[PDB]
Amino acid sequence: HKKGLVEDPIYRATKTMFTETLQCVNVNGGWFNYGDNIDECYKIDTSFITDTYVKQLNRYRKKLLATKHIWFTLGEDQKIAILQECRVALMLG
Amino acid sequence: MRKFIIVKNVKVDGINAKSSDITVGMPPATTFCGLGETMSIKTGIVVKAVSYGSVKFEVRGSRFNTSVTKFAWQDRGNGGKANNNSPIQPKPLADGVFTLCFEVEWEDCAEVLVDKVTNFINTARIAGGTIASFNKPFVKVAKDAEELASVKNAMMPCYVVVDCGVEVNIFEDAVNRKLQPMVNGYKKLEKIVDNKHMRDKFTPAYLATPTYTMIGYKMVSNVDNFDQALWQYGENTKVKTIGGIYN
RNA sequence: CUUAAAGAGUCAACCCUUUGCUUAUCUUCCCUAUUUAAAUGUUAGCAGCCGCAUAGGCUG
DNA sequence: AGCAATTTAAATAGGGAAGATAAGCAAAGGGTTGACGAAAGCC
DNA sequence: GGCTTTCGTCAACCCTTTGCTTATCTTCCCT
């Protein structure tokens, strides 16, 4: 829905890599609006366990499992552009 | 790519105003460079330069004489003379509200950097003076030169120190060009052969006579280059600005 | 680990008194405020009488 | 139950008076802030 | 054998009476 926003000046000064910047993306960058009903916001039911959802999750997870070996052979520039394409397709869907 | 943390409105009182034998007033840049390396030691954040400005500063005393300190009988062996007043050695005292801006290089979040600087400043002592109060320090970064000026203008309001150099000597130009003199460092005279009465026995010690440079006070926004206000330890047993002599 | 390290300035008080800022003034002449126009917006929500009604109807 | 119109021009000038004085007293304090050197009892 | 206390030793001025700087502000433009 929206990208995380980093207010931190040292993090904005230094962070460059993919995960090394992503570890600085916290809940306070827009997601944590006011925070008084957090315990109700994290008590969760598990009614998704159905037939077609579980098989779709399994087939896509194994697809990722089989292709993630080429992901580590990518460069920083690739990872950023590929994940931008993935985010654009995800909001499209 | 530069990173700074600014502590604004550092109200400090009890400052040892005796900068040297011939300078009494604002503490020199050797004091604030010493404060910077003090945090490099206690907090571990290694500090290149410090830009310090004076919001307020009053030397205790009149316009021609400083208020001397009533000494206490603290030496050993002069009991019996303790009922009379202790003799006064000259140490002027002063109060000062300062604004400090430390060049640091940091790799963690700004909150732990602010907390480390706050925990240092709560146990620090500006020029022998107890830090009465200080605002919460804030981190600002100088990516480019416009960002350097952003950090510069974030110290408003304060009168920072810019180096204007020595032409012939200190007294002559202080009358002629009317600039202020202060300790930019020291000159080593003799090696000290007795380390028994010192802080460390292994750190090499020298008797020193303070060298002085001539400086001016300019408001931090009116300073064109912030490197001319950031004092740092130069390799001539002195301190110096990054931008050199202010023109 | 900052000319680091450290330090009680205390006390006391009669500013007094005196006073002439007076004097004389020409503001003054001058002159076009002129010309229009729907008050509309239903512009009123009444008077009796048929009734237990301050419910509901009728009469013009 | 809101509706109240538009432009146009706002005076040119001449003056802002000098002459006097602007007190003389008497006070205004010091009190502590001395480190080396040298006799001289004393562990 | 230092060591810590107290007393004696050695001096002598020409002053002057605020600024130092002087504060972090909108053009294009299209949505």
From TrEMBL, chain A:
This is Uncharacterized protein. The chain holds residues 187 to 279 of 930 of the full protein.
Automatic annotation (TrEMBL), chain B:
This is Uncharacterized protein.
